[PDB]
Amino acid sequence: NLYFQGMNDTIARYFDAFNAGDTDGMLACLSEDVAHHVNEGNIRVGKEKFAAFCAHMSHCYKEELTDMVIFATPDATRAAAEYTVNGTYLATDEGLPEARQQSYKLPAGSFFDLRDGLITRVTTYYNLSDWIKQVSA
Amino acid sequence: NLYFQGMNDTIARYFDAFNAGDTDGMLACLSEDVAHHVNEGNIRVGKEKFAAFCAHMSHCYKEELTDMVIFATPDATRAAAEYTVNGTYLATDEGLPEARQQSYKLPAGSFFDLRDGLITRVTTYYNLSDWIKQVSA
Ligand SMILES: [Ca+2]
């Protein structure tokens, strides 16, 4: 059971870009065939969809990630991170509770597939019911 | 880029025990103060609760985990695992759909804290909406 940094630098860049509000930096970390596995949702393929997804998030939420742990990996083609999402609910996300600038804080995690240093798959996990409880009410 | 070896394979033992249906083996991987995060509002602490929880699972589901990838930190105090859950829904779990021996397959992920080689925290995520869709079919 050997572990190393693998392609973790890409994962670091990705999250750093997120915290900077830099979608361009995030997109730069992704392969053209990127499969985004939406929590409690569907699988969205490609950068056009990803950019749209980011825009949507940018409208609804203002967030910063803290307590970031990017795990050592047994395989350069895989990665994992656990962290804390801190945010403000700026504008109502369709189907979710009404936004009134609620403050929230939630544990989260992400798993990835990589190919040659680019993320080919991203799966983000968090407890949606927990979040809903915080913003409802 | 250097490597390290995680010699104490507590996480692997834990999942191996799970697969073998050996709750004793799972319990042995945990600290007396283990915090089982079902959700924010519901953190079950200790081995008595965990054993009851396994009995509950044992009643409702039969599952095997495959495609296991385990991640670590150099200090050995944090870990993550991504895998595939393959099961049969044996008996109804309160608030979930009716059990009819439906088969299901879905990805899942777990995050752990460890101290002195024992699991002190366990959190597991998966696409619940997807699961519900699968068993409702
Ligand atoms: Ca046993």
UniProtKB/TrEMBL annotation, chains A, B:
> What keywords were assigned to this record?
Calcium, Metal-binding, Plasmid
- For whether the record's keyword set contains Metal-binding, the answer is yes
**Superkingdom per UniProt:** Bacteria
Give me the residues that bind Ca(2+), please.
D22, D24
> What protein is this chain from?
Uncharacterized protein
